[PDB]
From Swiss-Prot, chains A, B:
GO molecular function, one term: identical protein binding
Pfam families linked: P1
Organism: Pseudomonas phage phi6
Protein name in UniProt: Major inner protein P1
Keywords: Capsid protein, Inner capsid protein, RNA-binding, T=2 icosahedral capsid protein, Transcription, Viral nucleoprotein, Virion
Keyword Transcription set for record: yes
Complex and partners: Homodimer. Associates with the polymerase complex.
Gene: P1
Role: P1 is the major inner capsid (core) protein of the polyhedral procapsid, which is responsible for genomic replication and transcription. Forms a dodecahedral shell from 60 asymmetric dimers. Binds to RNA and may be involved in genomic packaging.
């Protein structure tokens, strides 16, 4: 989370100004006035949360789910994007299905020996699996996935015959996806949309015929199984193609949409008869939520020639062949505000009344439960590692988190900065805005922190707007991978309040390849010390989405969304998951701390695991990397930074005594507040163990250096604030969130403030 | 063995003061006075001695014994504790039983070829064993053990079918366990308690069904054997779990016990209806011997929240599910004093009468027989090495030890220091205690010396109490692994004399997480120049266990315990044992010695094996590392150190001639005494061979340097004391106990003392 001036936001978060979504900079800040209105309505739904396992499992093969998986891993994987992955899949499909000699060997690994298929007899000496290893001996995939699926295909056609014997199970986790963003991602979605039928044709048709030729009872089959399989499988590859270009089909349908949206001349492009409203594309006229796609479309590219245009087509088929209707992906689909139904909102602020502090945010989780495991692997190959939870720690650490959910009630937490608003009087107001006030998005942090990219660097990248060109396919674009969502954020809850629309193409002087965002008249109070666009007249019109909110009521969020950990152990007690690795090793930390009793050190430390009381050291337990909370606590941390900076500056001059004590008074309980909650972090499960062992180490150190004489230090306040805050902070260190610098900075905060109490306790 | 002041023992062996078992240090030495009495009665039995072979053997598989083995090796192994070992076992059990493709391969190694299971025909071409190698090809264990057991499982279900053909046998040794100690060990015992049923569910149920499906006569089975086996085996894995947490269940039942023990407020924790005396937990009310578990429980940890508390539970099941009733382990179980029935006791001492010398000890072994072997191995893999004893040496070396048992009659040996007591007059007594007097435990030495850790370093570690943090999982904690037993020592024979109890929780000023040991009123003589707690009034009350003994009568031990070497060769003539390696290589020593006949050297040496008269050099004979005796002879050695130090100081000043000659007189025969017994060490079998060869080497050296002229040196006393004491000391060197420094120090002792005789010889 960060902040920016309202009047100067283009001079501030210039990239974030939506005008930036277009190549606009100019003397002019886009906008103007023009024409055609329609609230763009019905946005694609909420891909957030909803994490769960899925089962690849059966060779009966559902292409659909597998597609979902492809996009899933693709975003989650080591190789963007889905597109190239689909190419690679087709390559593999050639190398396998279109490469018959393999199949001879496969049947050879099955019943193969001599005079196959050993007449009418059964005998299916196979785990599904053993086939999988044999294919693993064949061409490696960077991303096997389908390497399972091809086996699944082997099962599907060998299912009618007596080789159902192997049947085990296969499992894989989801992966959270954003708003969801970029049209390139849609490109992935449409090629995947092809995969739905690029694959299913081989996933289906198949054969009920041949049992195993029958030929009572059925049947002998030399290479004939491999024969009938592959040659048909290759044939299935032939009908598969999808023909139609990925980026092209989206480019065109987007073209027709955006120029439909055009107030300035559609010209030869136009609404027409069967050119449009073909009992579906008009439903897209209702799906105008995917707006922004046109934005980057001109931005990522430029002119959007329909090139395979035709005029019968399309219409005809291509818009019909649009992805969401083929429904792969976290492409999701829904009405309006439900995606906004996780938007916080607090006008706060006063007298002016509008501007100095108006925050937004999101309601969120703390299902405390979090898990860890051994990576058992019945056979070496890749990462098909079975794992079982480690409940003995897994519960109590989660139990350790139980108060913590009552702590940092993020909604209530927002109230914190809102409370700051009255600081500092008195009223400005025209001379210096206004303020960002608003963003502090848990979502933007988690989206990037999930890849451990650290979002915070991306933040400033949206401050200046321009990407800092960290040229690497998993570096630079990933930053931008967020920025899209970031824009995608405000627009959606800029829908509600208000369905005001349009705007114009804003050609400027260069160059008319198209350039049209959206406008929002909303409705207003009669005073405008906020927004460069003075246009108070009745209401702002308005060029940029945020100002609507800037003129918006606090409304106070409905907002309920809060995720949940997947059950995992109940299934991986049977079957392997594959986001692993990712989840990592993973066991810090040795948090030593000093106690400077008069002119002496007596630093102590402790070896994580026995805080849990378990013994001894564990080597290979594997905690996840829980998300969500990181964003909260970070926001909490950084916002404290905003806090003490503001207040300290206030006492530095404002000015005028009646206020200074107020803030410096204010300051105190702020810290005092945190003080209190920090004990809840610790001495209440399980950091009491921490203070316990610390006392042990320190007194025993007294004895070891000799005297325990001075060692009254199990006592009061100063040492107690020391050890306690250290403790809760410490289990918090054992918590996988917030590093360490936050710790020293935190004690840096309390240390001037006062500490006093004596609150303990 | 060592010594310490009685009044100042907290300033001395501060760790040993039981108050140290709690975090207590303070201005105050724990104690005070309070309430609720009940002698804590019925201690878990005597795991000492009782060494013997056990047979893994049959695939009929007894989980119980195997469990015992797991704890056994665990303490004895390269990886503490049992807990992690059980985890690793579960991991392996996944990697094996829950990993089906393996089993296909296994049947393939059995009858596997084609169209399995080759109809109704028998043919069981297998040694049990060959399977074991095939599984060894699979995932390695650091600790195979169960790797055998899984094979045993293969046998158990393949037993109904014609594959009983392989049946050989499998064997493994015990391992001595202590008092026995720490509740973490109990944690091992409870997870092992799970193993009893974590394992047996797969060890049992199994199948009588299918013969081999029958299908007369029965049966064909492709992967169907592996199928039915593993899938059921995995299913058996599912019912296995044990669910309930290791450390938690003990933590809770211990909580209820200790707070039941609480004189200070139980508060919400309380005795109640079905909360307690549920026809068993009350038997634990009678099993209050496992006291101390609460002690370290607060010490190792802190607050003992019952967390899975409930109130129905537990009660209900968990205390029922306590380990000793599931009886794994050397957990052992018994009435009172039998564990104490190996406690020596000698008040000695005089006039005062109580304090200056009051010793304790233990009755002990010398079944002289000790053995050595070749490590024959029919096939390379690990250490399944067959061994046969080497009787020709093995008997005579044992024969060599035969007098030695009559020597060093440790009970009679105790009399030595007791005899020292009259030295030195005259009576103190208040000004300087008192003395430790008491400990010199064979047990504590052997417990650590078995791992060749050398206990003696641990000794001083209990002098200062604090561990010196030699951070290594098989270093530091192992020290502490002893210290527990060490405390565990005195308490038990602090039971008898007297069943006096309670004590209070001793919260001090920090911190009430619980802290309650035990107290002992006993009954006394009316004088107290012993114990800082003057409380003579009728009797001491008393804060620490040792003082009871300090006020105790000599009583003189019943005490009979003395172990025995296992028969070994009679079984390893058939089957491999697996404590091997451990037992080591193992053949020192080249003990050269000089004879400084006037102004000339003539040093001689001899090559161990021919002392036995055998020829030639043996490469690979493998003596054990006999224990027990090491502790005796060490105690003898160190106590001589106490002896000559004391006496020499006495002549240095005490003071007053009548005493000095006494002690310096005393001194003489002490040495004279040892002189005599040292000949019994040697020239009576088999060190006569040593003096023989020494004479050979020396006279032949005379001839080789030329003249044998001066060589009368097969003659008298001085040279004879030289060579004889050297001899007995030498075979003693060949004896695997007492190093070498002891030798030079020993001759250092005799050399001033006088030597004279002429006793020969």
């Amino acid at each position: 989370g960060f902040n920016l001036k309202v009047k100067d936001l283009n001079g501030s978060a210039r990239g974030l100004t939506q005008a930036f979504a277009i190549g606009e900079l100019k003397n002019q800040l886009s906008v103007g006035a023009l024409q055609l209105p329609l609230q763009f309505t019905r946005t694609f739904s909420a891909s957030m949360t909803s994490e769960l396992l899925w089962e690849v499992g059966k060779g009966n093969i559902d292409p659909v789910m597998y597609a979902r998986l492809f996009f899933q891993y693709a975003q989650a994987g080591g190789a963007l994007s889905v597109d190239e992955l689909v190419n690679q899949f087709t390559e593999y499909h050639q190398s396998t299905a279109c490469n018959p000699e393999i199949w001879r060997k496969l049947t050879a690994y099955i019943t193969g020996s001599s005079n196959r298929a050993i007449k009418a007899d059964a005998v299916g000496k196979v785990p599904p699996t053993a086939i999988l290893e044999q294919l693993r001996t064949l061409a490696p995939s960077e991303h096997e996935l389908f390497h399972h699926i091809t086996t699944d295909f082997v099962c599907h056609v060998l299912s009618p015959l007596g080789f159902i014997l192997p049947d085990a199970a296969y499992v894989y986790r989801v992966g959270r996806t954003a708003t969801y963003p970029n049209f390139y991602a849609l490109v992935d979605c449409v090629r995947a949309s092809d995969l739905r039928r690029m694959l299913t044709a081989l996933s289906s048709v198949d054969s009920k015929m041949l049992q195993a030729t029958f030929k009572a009872k059925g049947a002998l089959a030399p290479a004939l199984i491999s024969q009938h399989l592959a040659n048909a499988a290759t044939t299935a590859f032939e009908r598969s193609r999808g023909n139609f270009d990925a980026n092209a089909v989206v480019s065109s349908v987007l073209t027709i949409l955006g120029r439909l949206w055009s107030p300035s001349t559609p010209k030869e492009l136009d609404p027409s008869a069967r050119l449009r409203n073909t009992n579906g594309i008009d439903q897209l006229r209702s799906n105008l939520a995917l707006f922004i796609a046109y934005q980057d479309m001109v931005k990522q590219r430029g002119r959007a020639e329909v090139i395979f245009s035709d005029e019968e087509l399309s219409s005809t088929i291509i818009p019909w062949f649009i992805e969401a209707m083929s429904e792969v992906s976290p492409f999701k689909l829904r009405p309006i505000n439900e995606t906004t139904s996780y938007i916080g909102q607090t006008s706060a602020i006063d007298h002016m009344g509008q501007p100095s502090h108006v925050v937004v945010y999101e309601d969120w989780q703390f299902a405390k439960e979090i898990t860890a495991f051994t990576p058992v692997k019945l056979a070496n190959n890749s990462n098909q590692r079975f794992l079982d939870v480690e409940p003995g720690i897994s519960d109590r650490m989660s139990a350790t988190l139980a108060p913590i959910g009552n702590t940092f009630a993020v909604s209530a937490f927002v109230k914190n900065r809102t409370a700051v608003y009255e600081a500092v009087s008195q009223r400005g107001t025209v001379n210096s805005n206004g303020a960002e006030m608003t963003l502090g998005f848990p979502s933007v942090v988690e989206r990037d922190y999930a890849l451990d990219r650290d979002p915070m660097v991306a933040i400033a990248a949206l401050r200046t707007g321009i990407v800092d060109e960290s040229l690497e396919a998993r570096a630079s674009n990933d930053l931008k991978r967020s920025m899209f969502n970031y824009y995608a954020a405000v627009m959606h809850y800029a829908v509600a309040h208000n369905p005001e629309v349009v705007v114009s193409e804003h050609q400027g002087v260069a160059a008319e390849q198209g350039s049209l965002y959206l406008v929002w008249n909303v409705r207003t109070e009669l005073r405008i010390p906020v927004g460069y666009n003075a246009i108070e007249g009745g209401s702002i019109r308005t060029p940029e989405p945020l100002e609507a909110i800037a003129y918006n009521k606090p409304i106070q969020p409905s907002e309920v969304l809060q995720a949940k950990v997947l059950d995992l152990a109940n299934h991986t007690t049977s079957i392997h998951i594959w986001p692993w690795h990712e989840a990592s090793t993973e066991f810090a930390y040795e948090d030593a701390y000093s106690v400077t009793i008069r002119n002496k050190r007596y630093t102590a430390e402790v070896k994580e695991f026995e805080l849990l009381g378990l013994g001894q050291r564990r080597e290979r337990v594997r905690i996840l990397k829980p998300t969500v909370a990181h964003a909260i606590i970070q926001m909490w941390y950084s916002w404290f930074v905003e806090d003490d900076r503001t207040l300290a500056a206030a006492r530095r001059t404002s000015r005028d005594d009646a206020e200074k004590l107020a803030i410096d008074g204010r300051r105190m309980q702020n810290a005092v507040t945190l003080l209190r909650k920090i004990e809840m972090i610790g001495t209440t499960g399980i950091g009491a163990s921490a203070v316990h062992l610390a006392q042990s180490r320190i007194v025993d150190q007294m004895a070891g250096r000799g005297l325990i004489d001075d060692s009254s230090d199990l006592h009061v306040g100063i040492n107690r604030h020391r050890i306690r805050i250290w403790a809760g902070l410490a289990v918090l260190q054992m918590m996988g969130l917030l590093s360490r610098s936050e710790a020293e900075a935190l004690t840096k905060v309390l240390g001037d403030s006062n500490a006093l109490g004596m609150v303990v306790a």
